[PDB]
Amino acid sequence: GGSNDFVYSIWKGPVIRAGNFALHPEVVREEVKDKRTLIGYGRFFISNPDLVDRLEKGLPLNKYDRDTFYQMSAHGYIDYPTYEEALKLGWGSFVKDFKPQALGDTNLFKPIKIGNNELLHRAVIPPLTRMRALHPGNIPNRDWAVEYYTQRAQRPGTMIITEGAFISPQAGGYDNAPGVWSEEQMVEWTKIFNAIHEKKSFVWVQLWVLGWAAFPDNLARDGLRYDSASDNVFMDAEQEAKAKKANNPQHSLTKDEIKQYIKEYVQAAKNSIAAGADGVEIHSANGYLLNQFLDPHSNTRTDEYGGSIENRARFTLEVVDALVEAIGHEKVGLRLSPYGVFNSMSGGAETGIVAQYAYVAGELEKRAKAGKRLAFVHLVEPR
Numbered sequence: 066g067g068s069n070d071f072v073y074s075i076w077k078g079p080v081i082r083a084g085n086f087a088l089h090p091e092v093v094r095e096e097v098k099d100k101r102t103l104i105g106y107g108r109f110f111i112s113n114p115d116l117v118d119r120l121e122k123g124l125p126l127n128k129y130d131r132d133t134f135y136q137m138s139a140h141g142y143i144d145y146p147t148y149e150e151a152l153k154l155g156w157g158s159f160v161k162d163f164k165p166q167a168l169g170d171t172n173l174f175k176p177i178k179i180g181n182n183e184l185l186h187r188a189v190i191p192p193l194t195r196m197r198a199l200h201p202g203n204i205p206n207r208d209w210a211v212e213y214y215t216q217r218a219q220r221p222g223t224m225i226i227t228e229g230a231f232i233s234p235q236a237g238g239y240d241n242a243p244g245v246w247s248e249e250q251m252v253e254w255t256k257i258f259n260a261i262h263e264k265k266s267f268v269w270v271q272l273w274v275l276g277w278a279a280f281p282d283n284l285a286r287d288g289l290r291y292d293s294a295s296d297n298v299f300m301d302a303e304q305e306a307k308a309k310k311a312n313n314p315q316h317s318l319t320k321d322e323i324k325q326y327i328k329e330y331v332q333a334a335k336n337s338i339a340a341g342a343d344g345v346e347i348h349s350a351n352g353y354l355l356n357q358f359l360d361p362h363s364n365t366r367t368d369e370y371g372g373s374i375e376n377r378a379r380f381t382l383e384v385v386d387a388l389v390e391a392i393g394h395e396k397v398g399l400r401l402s403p404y405g406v407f408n409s410m411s412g413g414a415e416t417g418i419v420a421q422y423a424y425v426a427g428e429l430e431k432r433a434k435a436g437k438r439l440a441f442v443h444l445v446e447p448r
């Protein structure tokens with residue numbers, strides 16, 4: 066329990082903050098007074114393709130339908146209306162008791178350069194897993210994905226971060242999330258990136274590795290390991306049961322296996338940039354594999370990759386450095402969730418949690434002062 070504000074005392078570059086901001090313009094108005102703060106809006110970008118217009122002008126917001134967040138359907142994906150469309154449908158309904166503020170007069174609508182991209186405003190689409198990829202193959206949805214991203218790219222100069230995308234088969238384990246390792250995948254991503262660019266917006270691929278959050282039975286079917294930092298602490302009882310039934314026990318990664326993941330991160334980043342992406346974001350949050358190394362609950366290792374703040378941060382920072390070298394610091398961002406407890410991370414109950422994340426922020430600032438500043442740090446807010 067606590068605040069992410071500590072990061073601003075350490076890292077001096079752009080910071081994207083996400084969590085419960087759409088219904089709190091009064092909070093946003095204060096936050097964007099800081100000249101390097103951007104705001105990610107998740108659930109309300111799902112439900113409002115023209116969210117940026119509505120934020121600028123202080124318009125009512127479309128309610129979101131959580132039941133279709135992960136359903137294999139166009140409904141709840143590409144059929145939420147723009148405000149003028151909604152008025153034609155007689156919707157004038159919208160979110161209840163919400164008092165909108167026109168935020169057009171604030172830094173939210175001031176231009177900012179992120180990486181190589183000239184953003185025209187600071188409302189960012191954060192990564193949103195929608196589970197509409199095709200199985201087998203983890204292929205971006207050929208029916209609706211281009212339309213979905215095109216709708217949400219509609220305001221010129223919008224930064225879009227894609228839903229988490231698996232860097233390899235071993236990195237995955239959900240059948241209906243997309244990957245970025247194969248040619249059939251990249252054929253569809255190219256179409257998505259083209260459409261976003263045709264709308265004068267920008268796109269960054271979130272690179273995803275599941276670790277203990279993967280489904281051990283899916284991995285077992287595909288001849289893959291069930292991976293984490295350690296082999297003596299498990300995500301939850303269901304996952305423990307699944308691993309036992311699939312005869313696929315959680316496996317503590319060897320140093321060579323870590324190296325192989327780094328190789329796959331580099332290849333996935335290269336694939337993304339080749340297909341037209343503006344950059345990549347490393348998912349080191351929400352209790353996935355990198356987070357499993359950062360967190361002392363999940364990381365009980367006694368080698369170079371656990372047992373101290375520096376050791377726990379080593380995998381995340383190795384991935385950062387490998388990507389910076391491969392594609393350039395201006396095309397790399399990093400996502401963190403210091404207070405998260407999702408997927409059995411520790412959050413603020415771990416007294417050393419701020420130190421762990423302060424260390425990572427400090428190492429990023431150190432690299433920046435030496436000439437290699439990441440495009441951004443993206444923080445999950447405990448809101």
Ligand SMILES: Cc1cc2nc3c(=O)[nH]c(=O)nc-3n(C[C@H](O)[C@H](O)[C@H](O)COP(=O)(O)O)c2cc1C
Pocket residue numbers: 083084085086087105106107108109134191192193194195228229271348350351400445
């Ligand atoms: C349906 C859904 C899918 C999400 N998928 C991802 C994801 O793939 N990667 C990630 O880092 N965060 C993901 N998040 C977290 C969001 O990026 C973001 O932090 C959150 O939506 C912000 O809170 P808000 O919905 O109140 O704006 C997801 C959130 C939701 C609701």
